[PDB]
Design a protein around this ligand. Structure first.
Ligand SMILES: [Ca+2]
Ligand SMILES: [Ca+2]
Length: 673
């Protein structure tokens, strides 16, 4: 399907000004004009590839007088010649006619065997040229300095790819034509086989000869294809270390990928929040588990892997540490190499969500290691109610397109450990939480002034990178992420890159960046950060708050209400930074009665299967609705955001909601309900 030969077609006479770059699967190297105006006249054209077969052959084309043909560097056209079953031969073909009266080029390629069967060279005996930074022992490689297949001028001057029903075209970019048609205009360094410096050529990327599992956005030459993994623990379950009654504490967790300032760190970490709610009694966990001073405890949890990246992993999963406190590693989760039941795809889990999560200590695994804590680690644990999950960047082997057989395959000689150094070396990183408020990294090829090779890649402008990498557009002129204006998110950098940007603005006589993004330029090693303005973000850049206005507003559209609970319409996004609600009744004088006056009893919201939110007033009022012994009493519901979420009885022990900073979001009389 992606096999055959590779044609350059120049409008000029000498392979100087390339019009179309394409491939035919059989011998017929034609191109109907039905597939292309003042430029549709090729005065020269080249064709490159190999050939496999045993017999005595004679090559003939439909123009043995405009052509030259070499098989393994020997001339054959400007006569019979022997070939052998099970060997490949280079194949170069040139063409030149001085004033082609027609548009396009009709040109087939024949071969006649010994029985005299002449014909066009089947697609089964035709293979591409080995466009790859290195030569195989079967195939060798030789206006394509980086050898990626896309001709130099084209890679410098821009090029587009029209996806015809058989094969693809690669042609110069033209404003009047493709600009209206909305075809994506490409550019890329002619001296990088791959410009985002990853493992797919600038050629494989645009022509679809690439691991299908790679992100559509990373199909761009300047958008970097590479994995990004983190471990999403989904919940947890604690035991006393060794015939007594089941004495454990099972609780959900919430895990978010993190980035600590922007900061030049390339690590993969995420941070677990063990739920602090109510699971009968206000017992300490040792009181809940019969743990003594000199006891031990052990941990278990279902965890999935998360690729928030653009390339996929195949045979080796990255090794995690379960750290507690700042640096106390309780465990080291490993997966069994070259044995991955499935692949882990970008924007996707392993095990898939339709399947089970991994348990740290799987059912019948006799070699699963006890994750143990001493006593003061266990207190420590309850105190902080949180564990971190650092994950290396050993990702194993890569699925590289094979040219000879036009098939994508895991390739043993190509490892992700030999590529990340340079991706992260010669690209500028961006981190955006615009999607479901999660930190999502990406990287874009950007000029490295103090490095001559990185000054051969096209310029990358802020406005552009957002569009190629993250999919902004400008439907009416203003730049947008799936609805939201680019002004809705803020810009953080790290320090060197901040200075850098600052400087540029003074130069453009600009005072506001949002209105000069197109003019801002991106250099390699830049780190950038972009977060929805509506929110407060902790030191790990996770969303953990909001304005009192943002929240109150969010909850303003109430649907129904009753002495049994509120039924609102709240944004999935707001709903992500809320940790619970408080319910109280205000008598006529001003006293307040707290229906659920505990720090682990605030979990009374439950998202319906219809998208709306219901606030179960009954859940902690003893399954009873609310009793209002005077209609002029008010029913007041505050909201509590994660940043003001108490998770342990105060210093004096008071386990009430007393003191908790919360937000009034609903108030009505007994008679207003
Ligand atoms: Ca090239
Ligand atoms: Ca290139």
């Amino acid at each position: 399907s992606s096999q055959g030969l590779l044609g350059y077609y120049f409008s000029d006479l000498n392979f100087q000004a390339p019009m179309v770059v394409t491939s035919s699967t059989t011998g017929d190297l034609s191109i109907p004009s039905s597939e292309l105006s003042e430029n549709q006249y090729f005065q020269s054209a080249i064709w490159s590839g190999f050939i496999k077969v045993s017999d005595e052959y004679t090559f003939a084309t439909s123009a043995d007088n405009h052509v030259t043909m070499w098989v393994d560097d020997q001339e054959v056209i400007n006569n019979k010649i022997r070939l052998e079953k099970g060997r490949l031969y280079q194949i170069k073909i040139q063409y030149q006619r001085e004033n082609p009266t027609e548009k396009g080029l009709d040109f087939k390629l024949y071969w006649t065997d010994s029985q005299n069967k002449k014909e066009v060279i089947s697609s089964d005996n035709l293979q591409l040229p080995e466009l790859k930074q290195k030569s195989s022992n079967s195939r060798k490689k030789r206006p394509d300095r980086d050898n990626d297949g896309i001709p130099d001028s084209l890679e410098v001057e821009g090029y587009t790819v029209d996806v015809k029903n058989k094969r693809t075209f690669l042609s110069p970019w033209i404003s009047n034509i493709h600009e209206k048609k909305g075809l994506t205009k490409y550019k890329s360094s002619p001296e990088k086989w791959s410009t985002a410096s990853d493992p797919y050529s600038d050629f494989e990327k645009v022509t679809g000869r690439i691991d299908k599992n790679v992100s559509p956005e990373a199909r761009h030459p300047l958008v970097a294809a590479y994995p990004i993994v983190h471990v999403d623990m989904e919940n947890i379950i604690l035991s006393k270390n060794e015939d007594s009654q089941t004495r454990t504490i099972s609780k959900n967790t919430s895990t978010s990928r993190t980035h600590t300032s922007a900061g030049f760190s390339n690590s993969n970490s995420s941070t677990v929040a063990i739920d602090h709610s109510l699971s009968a009694g206000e017992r300490t966990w040792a009181e809940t588990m019969g743990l003594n001073t000199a006891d031990t405890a052990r941990l278990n949890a279902n965890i999935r892997y998360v690729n928030t990246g653009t390339a996929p992993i195949y045979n080796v999963l990255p090794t995690t540490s379960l750290v507690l406190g700042k640096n106390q590693t309780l465990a080291t989760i490993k997966a069994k190499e070259n044995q991955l039941s499935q692949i882990l795809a970008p924007n996707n889990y392993y095990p898939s969500k339709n399947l089970a999560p991994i348990a740290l200590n799987a059912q019948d695994d006799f070699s699963s290691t006890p994750i143990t804590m001493n006593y003061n680690q266990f207190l420590e644990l309850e105190k902080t109610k949180q564990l971190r999950l650092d994950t290396d960047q050993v990702y194993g082997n890569i699925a590289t397109y094979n040219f000879e057989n036009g098939r994508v395959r895991v390739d043993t000689g190509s490892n992700w450990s030999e590529v990340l150094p340079q991706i992260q070396e010669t690209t500028a990183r961006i981190i955006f939480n615009g999607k479901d408020l999660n930190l999502v990294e990406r990287r874009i090829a950007a000029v490295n002034p103090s490095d001559p090779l990185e000054t051969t890649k096209p310029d990358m402008t802020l406005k552009e990178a957002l569009k190629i990498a993250f999919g902004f557009n400008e439907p009416n002129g203003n730049l947008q992420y799936q609805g939201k204006d680019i002004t809705e998110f803020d810009f953080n950098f790290d320090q060197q890159t901040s200075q850098n940007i600052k400087n540029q603005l003074a130069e453009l006589n600009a005072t506001n960046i949002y209105t000069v993004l197109d003019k801002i330029k991106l250099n390699a090693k830049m780190n950038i950060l972009i977060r929805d303005k509506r929110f407060h973000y902790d030191r790990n850049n996770i969303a953990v708050g909001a304005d009192e206005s943002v929240v109150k507003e969010a909850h303003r559209e109430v649907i129904n209400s009753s002495t049994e609970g509120l039924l609102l319409n709240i944004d999935k996004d707001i709903r992500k930074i809320l940790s619970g609600y408080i319910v109280e009744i205000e008598d006529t004088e001003g006293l307040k009665e707290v229906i659920n006056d505990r720090y682990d009893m605030l979990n009374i919201s439950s998202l319906r299967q219809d998208g709306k939110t219901f606030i179960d007033f009954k859940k902690y009022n003893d399954k009873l609705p609310l009793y209002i012994s005077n209609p002029n009493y008010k029913v007041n519901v505050y909201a509590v955001t994660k940043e003001n979420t108490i998770i342990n009885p105060s210093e004096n022990g008071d386990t009430s909601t007393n003191g908790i900073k919360k937000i009034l979001i609903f108030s009505k009389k007994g008679y207003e309900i």
